């Protein structure tokens, strides 16, 4: 590579440059984030701990003309892997997170190109908190919500938004989470309904604050009861209908009360099992529950 | 140090196939990077086939289609082409160029072998037979050597006393399949009737040994 | 396919001194990228081919520092700053654009020396020959430069065409000269039949072409 | 190298996950010719504390460790006595599989196996050898101090022999390889069981027998007896099902 | 920006940040403390501790890190890692996993005048003596001592941060509300050393009360 | 010893390992990947992740880490830390909740020839679609898809070491028999970027379930309770008996469904074998 080291060469020593400082002619100004997610998998959404845990690859893409070059006085080189301690990077953190881990996995290489552009695809692991309507349990659905932002600056340092794309020459964002038809494995209890992505502003806070802007990206998803219908359902409502029996049963045969009282051990053993797999939220009872 | 080594050379016959390998050693070479070139008595350079990094398996030119299987080794350092259907025309000096780092879209040959001979034809081994180009103030005479099978011939003058002026001609492979080739010196007229010239011709597939006497 | 073509046929280089060779393409060799994918190849006498410049301007690792390259697309030119003797051989232009690869015909390369004329010497069939039932009539050119010579052979003054092979000599390491061998054959009846048997030459330090007959 | 393994506490064996956690540190020894020096020409120094960062180490793993912690737990000086001498004493946690032989479970006696190898050199490189006693007998097997040894609520090491294992050494195979494999035997005591399983269990599973002799008639209560047993037995498969191995 | 660079330049020229900015000795660095709380994960009844998620408020002042904005193109403030900048060793004292420090270090805000901001995130486990008596119909009274680790009272002293404010700050519209506790009071407190190594603490007060739905209906 | 001192002090004075090791920027390292599979830690039926223990082989040249034996003493081989050397980015592109690259930077052991063998170890979660319709006796085809996250095919090359994963080393597994093991190399190309493929190996498993354990603990009760479903009715009805023994079989079966949500996958992509036939029982009691 005389050519990519004599190009890094020349980007890094000789133009002296500093990954500390923004890539910003002046200080007033704000760099430009665009940011997507793509899902790689949707792992599980704990009930009691009230945590989703998903596999997320993040989408950066930003300009630095500092790392600008002309490809052709560098035998046309047009895209550089670099490390990603090597330049500055847009620190986003997911915000809305219940472990500490705030920040991506893995960090991969930056690509960057000729022209200025700076990609970077860090995949990550993340356990977001997501509170739980039990109300409808097991046929209920859920909105949990994946909030990035960044704390080390604020939106009058860098500006969050969508990652476009183009498709006839025209230009629109990607208001969803990316999802590969052909790589993603559904959830087996869990189906995607809606996965919008949204830039949050608000007016309140002010612009030095990290509060001021996040990008969001949601997950409306239903829950695929077949496995809680199989396995509680039907045993618990057919044996609570057999506690009807006794009615029809002769007073003579002298089995009578046994026959409802066992009904209601029943009961309460499924009363055991359900008690386990739930938060003890105080919002409403589940339908199971009632 | 890195080099080169292809297998020995080759005698086949029409309708045969060689299978010629090319080892490595002082590097270490991949799955890519192999090229075949051949050059044929006399002509030039042949490209043959060979596996680039873009293609992921090996391509051929349109002659050897067909006929031809080129593979790397990466595990054992070593590549291999294999000729089949082998014509009149494939005698030539086989070529491996490699690299150790493979270029995408084309190829480089930065390590090459020796060459290894392969000859297809259907001639057995048959000794020359030696003439004398007898002598008509320089005069000239020589040797001779026609209709041998295979090569080579080594042609001395004098047992080799006599090394001023001798030419030895490169043979030239006939229609019939047998070579020929023609040793001269060029002598003082005046030693003509003085000097004894003999040629000590020398085919050892054959075992011929003839010292022919050169004289008007 | 693309077709190579490389100017001069034949180049005679001044140990001490520059010298160029050039090459040509009916199809542009430029890559999407800017690349231009020619290679250049040397073949010094008994040698395996080196490459000496790869993608028409970079020299290779291990090539000295002498050789160089250029070019745009379809014509491209190999320099040498200063010719070493070591420099002597063949030159291969290859393009490594589109499959299948091809090089050019060659330009061999050889020392220069002042023009010499051959010296034309012609050998009839001996009796041993012709008691086998063949004639072989042998025409020499002795210690001449430049290695282009014409040799047209004719029996009772009609050109003979298609029966006739040449062999030449590498160009000698001291006094720089090649030597050449025509060798006529025909049947021992066809030669009996014709009278006069002449070997006719051609070559630019003859001021006229030189010939050589006997008579049987 | 010289290598001593000293067992501390054997933690637990856990049958679901197949592991077993041991704490233990081990003894390696070996020479360094460019740390060779002479007490007489530093004022008498004997030995010299080091990081072991700053020394060569043959970065000896248990290569059959199940979490991915290879390493040591705690990186200690090194001491480098005068004539080259090194002698590095880590402390360690290991995490190592167990696969867990559950026939006659909680009757069952274990083959826990720690292997020890360096993970960089070959056996041509770096060659093990059993550390030697003051009395000079060779300790192949786990070293324990009798003083300081609490044996585990559940489990009693038997036997714990050590072998220097050599393969790879052909020439198909190429360089040789090598470790060391510690062979801990170990014991269940089957108490907790006996008392709060096993003998329960029987005397509910012996019930039964009392059917034959209740009457055969309507207040006999012969099917009551039975089938709650076969509860009882139901409720003790929710039970074992929490202990056994899977 | 260039201009920014030369400002950094100049600023950590001679600057350890080791050392507790002290223009004379004797001199005390006043530390505002104050809690965000983003979310009250938890409270384990079983191992007697209460997870939360907060944003610490930490404002103190470095008389090394001031500057004149008119000779460095009017920049009036700059945002710096935390680690290259001297920081209070703030810690919660009263954890009960072992883990003291924040969960991501960020950067600070310094003004031009030398006061430093820091609002870094953290993810805490404190201990927390659970009252059963009157479980689940129980409230809880779980504290976070917040205090330097290392320096006494004479080096780094402590106040409640405010911007007369002694409370744990909710924000309304973005605080996760938690399913099973309801926030009571909130307050906080500075505690002196009774009556040299004392240290001063600043204890925030959680008193939350357990919403008891699920056993009312289950038990 | 000084020797191989001096020579990496030489061979690192003025390397650099973020770049890709080529004589020139426009030829492709070749990486030849194998993996070995120590251990078949377990399989999540509920989050469908199958844990495993490997060796990640990897084999490249470098071509600046080269050197004479001759000229360092015979010096022919030499162990390097993996962290000052570039290296592939190889990913666990189907890692489920785990590392997705290598964690463990092993030293890589390098050849005079600028040959760099590299084995780390890594603890592999790969997402794995489990099918349950035939659980206990089901058959899972699970993949670890591997390739370089940030590098495309025509700057770095990936081949397998060998048509399947090494499985020499492999420890026994108390619940899986590996049927079947391959690795594929998979080649992608999109019109936007017709020049620049993507590369990937996958190496799949087939494993069959060892169902012993859940004959024994699941199946044999549900039988045993099936088979008493049937006895009250050769009870006498004068015996006050019928309504005890078949209640009491349903609460027998009531707490073994315990033992059953315990043991079967709480997933919804189908059910179970195991759950119809507790299914079968618990209606026809
Ligand atoms: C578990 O799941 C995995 C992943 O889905 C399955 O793996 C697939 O297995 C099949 C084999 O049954 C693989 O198919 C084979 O791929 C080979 C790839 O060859 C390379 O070269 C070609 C170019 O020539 C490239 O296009 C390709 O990408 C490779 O680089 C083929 O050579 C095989 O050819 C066979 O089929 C053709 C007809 O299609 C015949 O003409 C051939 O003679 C030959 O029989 C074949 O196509 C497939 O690639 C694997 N996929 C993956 C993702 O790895 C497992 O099989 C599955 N396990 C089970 C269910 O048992
Ligand atoms: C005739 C047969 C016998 C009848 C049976 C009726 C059985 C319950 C039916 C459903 C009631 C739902 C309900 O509104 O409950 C309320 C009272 O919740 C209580 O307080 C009830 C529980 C009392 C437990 C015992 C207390 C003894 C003192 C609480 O409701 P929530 O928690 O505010 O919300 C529930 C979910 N929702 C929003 C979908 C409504
Ligand atoms: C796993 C270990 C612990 C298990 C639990 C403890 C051990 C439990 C088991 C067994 C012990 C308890 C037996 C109680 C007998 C009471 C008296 C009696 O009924 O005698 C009987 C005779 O009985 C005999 O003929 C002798 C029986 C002795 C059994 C000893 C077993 C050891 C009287 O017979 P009968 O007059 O015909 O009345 C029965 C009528 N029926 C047959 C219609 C029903
Ligand atoms: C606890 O575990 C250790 C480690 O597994 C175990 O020690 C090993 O025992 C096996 C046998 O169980 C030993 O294998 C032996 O190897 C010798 C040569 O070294 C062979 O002669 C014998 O192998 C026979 O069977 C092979 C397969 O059928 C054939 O290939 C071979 O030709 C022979 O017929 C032999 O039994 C092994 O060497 C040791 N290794 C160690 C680490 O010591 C130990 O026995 C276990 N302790 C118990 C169960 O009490
Ligand atoms: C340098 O390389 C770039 C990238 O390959 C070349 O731009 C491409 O040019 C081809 C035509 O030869 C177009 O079809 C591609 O769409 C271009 N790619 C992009 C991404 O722009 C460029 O032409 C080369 N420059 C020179 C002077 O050769
Ligand atoms: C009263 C006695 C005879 C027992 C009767 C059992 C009946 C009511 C049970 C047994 C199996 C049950 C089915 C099992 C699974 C499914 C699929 C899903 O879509 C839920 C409904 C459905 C279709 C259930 C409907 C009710 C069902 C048919
Ligand atoms: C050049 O000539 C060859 C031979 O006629 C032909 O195959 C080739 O297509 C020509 N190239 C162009 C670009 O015309
Ligand atoms: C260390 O050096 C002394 C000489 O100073 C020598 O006597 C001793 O044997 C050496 N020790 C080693 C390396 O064995």
């Known amino acids: 590579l005389n050519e990519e080291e004599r190009l890094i060469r020349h980007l890094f020593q000789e133009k002296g440059y500093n990954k500390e400082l923004r890539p910003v002619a002046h200080k007033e100004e704000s760099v430009d984030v665009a940011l997507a997610l793509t899902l790689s998998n949707l792992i599980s959404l704990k009930e009691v701990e009230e945590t989703l845990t998903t596999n997320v690859w993040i989408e950066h893409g930003w300009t630095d003309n500092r790392l600008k070059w002309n490809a052709e006085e560098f035998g046309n080189i047009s ?80 500006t969050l938004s969508l990652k476009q794309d183009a498709k006839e020459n025209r230009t629109y964002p990607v208001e969803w989470i990316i999802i590969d038809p052909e790589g993603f494995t559904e959830n087996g209890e869990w189906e995607i309904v809606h996965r919008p992505a949204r830039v949050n502003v608000d007016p309140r806070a002010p612009l030095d604050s990290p509060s001021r802007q996040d990008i969001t990206f949601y997950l409306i998803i239903r829950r695929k009861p077949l496995f809680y219908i199989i396995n509680i359902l039907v045993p618990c409502v057919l044996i609570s209908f057999m506690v009807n029996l006794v009615f029809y049963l002769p007073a003579d045969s002298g089995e009578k009360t046994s026959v409802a009282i066992s009904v209601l051990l029943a009961q309460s053993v499924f009363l055991l099992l359900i008690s386990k797999r739930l938060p003890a939220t105080s919002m409403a009872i589940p339908l199971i529950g009632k | 140090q890195v080099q080169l080594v292809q297998s020995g050379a080759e005698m086949k016959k029409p309708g045969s196939s060689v299978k010629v390998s090319c080892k490595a050693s002082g590097g270490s070479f991949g799955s890519y990077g192999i090229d075949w070139v051949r050059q044929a008595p006399g002509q030039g350079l042949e490209w043959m086939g060979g596996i680039m990094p873009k293609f992921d398996a090996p391509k051929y030119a349109e002659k050897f289609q067909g006929r031809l299987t080129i593979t790397a080794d990466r595990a054992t350092n070593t590549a291999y082409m294999e000729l089949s259907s082998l014509r009149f025309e494939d005698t030539a000096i086989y070529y491996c160029a490699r690299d150790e780092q493979p270029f995408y879209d084309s190829w480089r040959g930065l390590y090459w072998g020796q060459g290894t001979l392969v000859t297809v034809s259907s001639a057995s081994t048959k000794g020359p037979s030696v003439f004398p180009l007898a002598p008509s103030g320089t005069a000239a005479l020589g040797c001779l050597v026609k209709d041998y099978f295979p090569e080579p011939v080594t042609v001395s003058w004098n047992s080799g006393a006599l090394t001023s002026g001798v030419h030895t001609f490169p043979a030239v492979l006939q229609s019939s399949g047998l070579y020929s080739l023609s040793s001269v010196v060029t002598v003082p007229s005046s030693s003509l009737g003085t000097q004894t010239y003999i040629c000590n011709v020398n085919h050892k597939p054959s075992n011929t040994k003839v010292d022919k006497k050169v004289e008007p | 396919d693309i077709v190579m073509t490389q100017s001069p046929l034949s180049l005679p280089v001044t140990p001490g001194e520059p010298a160029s060779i050039s090459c040509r393409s009916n199809q542009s060799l430029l890559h999407t990228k800017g690349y231009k994918y020619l290679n250049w190849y040397l073949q010094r006498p008994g040698q395996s081919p080196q490459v000496l410049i790869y993608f028409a301007s970079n020299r290779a690792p291990g090539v000295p520092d002498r050789f160089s390259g250029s070019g745009s697309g379809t014509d491209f030119t190999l320099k040498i700053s200063r010719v070493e003797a070591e420099d002597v051989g063949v030159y291969y232009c290859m393009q490594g654009l589109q499959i299948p690869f091809t090089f050019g015909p060659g330009t061999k390369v050889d020392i220069k020396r002042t023009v010499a004329a051959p010296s034309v010497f012609i050998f009839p069939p001996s009796d041993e020959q012709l008691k086998s039932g063949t004639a072989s009539v042998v025409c020499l050119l002795n210690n001449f430069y430049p290695r282009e010579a014409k040799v047209q052979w004719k029996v009772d003054n009609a050109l003979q065409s298609g029966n006739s092979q040449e062999s030449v000599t590498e160009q000698d390491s001291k006094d720089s000269t090649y030597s050449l061998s025509s060798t006529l054959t025909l049947s021992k009846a066809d030669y009996e039949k014709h009278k006069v048997y002449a070997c006719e030459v051609t070559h630019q330090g003859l001021s006229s072409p030189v010939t050589k007959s006997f008579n049987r | 190298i010289s290598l001593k393994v000293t067992l501390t ?238 | 920006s260039e201009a920014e660079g030369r400002l950094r330049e100049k600023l950590f020229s001679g600057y350890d940040s080791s050392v507790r900015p002290a223009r004379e000795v004797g001199d005390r660095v006043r530390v505002s403390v104050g809690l965000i709380l983003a979310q009250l994960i938890s409270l384990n009844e079983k191992d007697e501790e209460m997870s939360t998620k907060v944003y610490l408020d930490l404002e103190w002042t470095d008389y090394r890190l001031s500057w004149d904005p008119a000779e460095h193109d009017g920049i009036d403030s700059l945002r710096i890692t935390a680690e290259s900048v001297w920081l209070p060793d703030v810690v919660l004292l009263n954890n009960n996993d072992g883990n003291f420090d924040v969960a991501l270090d960020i950067s600070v805000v310094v003004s031009s005048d030398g006061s430093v901001r820091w609002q870094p995130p953290g993810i805490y486990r404190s201990s927390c003596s659970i009252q059963v008596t009157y479980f689940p119909f129980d409230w809880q009274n779980c504290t976070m001592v917040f205090s330097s680790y290392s320096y006494d009272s004479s080096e780094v002293s402590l106040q409640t941060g405010l911007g007369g404010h002694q409370e744990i700050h909710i924000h309304e519209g973005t605080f996760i509300e938690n399913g099973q506790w309801e926030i009571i009071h909130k307050p906080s407190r500075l505690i002196q050393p009774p009556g040299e190594g004392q240290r001063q603490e600043v204890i925030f007060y959680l008193i939350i009360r357990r919403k008891p739905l699920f056993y009312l209906v289950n038990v | 010893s000084e020797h191989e001192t001096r020579l990496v002090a030489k061979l ?274």
């Open chain 6, 12 to 285: 690192f004075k003025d390397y650099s390992s973020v770049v890709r090791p080529v004589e020139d920027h426009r030829q492709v390292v070749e990486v030849t990947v194998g993996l070995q599979l120590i251990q078949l830690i377990n399989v999540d039926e509920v989050n469908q992740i199958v844990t495993t223990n490997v060796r990640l082989k990897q084999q490249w040249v470098d071509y600046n880490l080269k050197w004479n034996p001759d000229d360092y003493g015979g010096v022919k081989k030499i162990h390097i830390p993996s962290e000052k050397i570039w290296r592939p980015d190889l990913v666990l592109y189907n890692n489920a909740d785990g590392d997705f690259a290598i964690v463990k930077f092993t030293k890589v052991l390098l050849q005079y020839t600028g040959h760099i063998t590299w084995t780390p170890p890594a603890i592999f979660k790969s997402y794995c679609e489990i099918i349950v319709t035939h659980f206990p006796f089901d058959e899972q085809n699970c993949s670890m898809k591997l390739g370089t996250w940030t590098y495309d095919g025509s700057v770095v090359a990936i081949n397998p070491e060998s048509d399947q994963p090494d499985l020499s080393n492999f420890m026994e597994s108390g619940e899986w028999v590996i049927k079947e093991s391959r690795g594929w190399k998979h080649s992608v190309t999109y019109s936007c970027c017709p020049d620049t493929p993507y590369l990937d190996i996958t190496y799949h498993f087939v494993m069959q379930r060892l169902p012993l354990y859940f004959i024994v603990n699941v199946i044999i009760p549900c039988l045993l309770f099936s088979f008493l479903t049937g006895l009250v009715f050769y009870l006498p009805t004068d015996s006050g008996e019928k309504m005890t023994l078949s209640i009491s079989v349903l609460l027998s079966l009531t707490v073994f469904l315990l033992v059953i949500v315990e043991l079967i996958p709480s997933t919804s992509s189908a059910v179970p074998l195991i759950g119809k036939y507790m299914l079968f029982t618990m209606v026809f009691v």
């Open chain 1, 79 to 158: 895209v550089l892997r670099l490390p990603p301690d090597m330049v500055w990077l847009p620190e986003i953190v997911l915000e809305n997170n219940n472990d500490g881990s705030f920040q991506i996995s893995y960090s991969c290489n930056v690509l960057v190109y000729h022209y200025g552009f700076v990609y970077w695809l860090p995949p990550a692991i993340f356990r977001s908190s997501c509170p739980i309507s039990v109300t409808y349990f097991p046929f209920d659905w859920q909105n949990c919500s994946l909030k990035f932002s960044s704390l080390k600056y604020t939106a009058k340092e860098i």
């Open chain 4, 9 to 246: 506490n054997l933690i637990s064996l856990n049958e679901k996950e197949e592991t077993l956690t041991t704490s233990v540190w081990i003894g390696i020894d070996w020479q360094d010719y460019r740390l060779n020096y002479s007490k007489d020409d530093f004022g008498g120094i004997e030995t010299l504390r080091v990081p072991s960062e700053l020394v060569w180490l043959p970065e000896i793993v248990l290569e059959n460790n199940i979490d991915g912690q290879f390493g040591v737990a705690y990186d200690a000086n090194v001491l480098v006595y005068e004539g080259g001498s090194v002698t590095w004493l880590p402390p360690a946690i290991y995490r190592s599989v167990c696969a867990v032989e559950v026939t006659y479970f909680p009757f069952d006696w274990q083959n826990c196996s720690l292997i020890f190898r360096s993970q960089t050199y070959n056996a041509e490189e770096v060659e093990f050898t059993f550390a030697v006693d003051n009395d000079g007998k060779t300790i192949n097997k786990i070293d324990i101090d009798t003083e300081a040894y609490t044996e585990n609520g559940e489990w009693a090491i038997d036997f714990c022999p050590g072998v220097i294992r050599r393969h790879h050494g052909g020439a198909t195979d190429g360089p040789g390889e090598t470790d060391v494999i510690y062979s801990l035997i170990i014991r269940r005591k089957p108490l907790f069981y006996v008392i709060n399983i096993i003998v329960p269990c029987v005397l509910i599973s012996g019930l039964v027998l009392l059917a034959y002799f209740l009457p055969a008639q309507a207040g006999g209560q012969k099917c009551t007896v039975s089938i709650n047993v076969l509860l009882a037995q139901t409720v003790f498969l929710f039970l074992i099902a929490q202990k056994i191995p899977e």
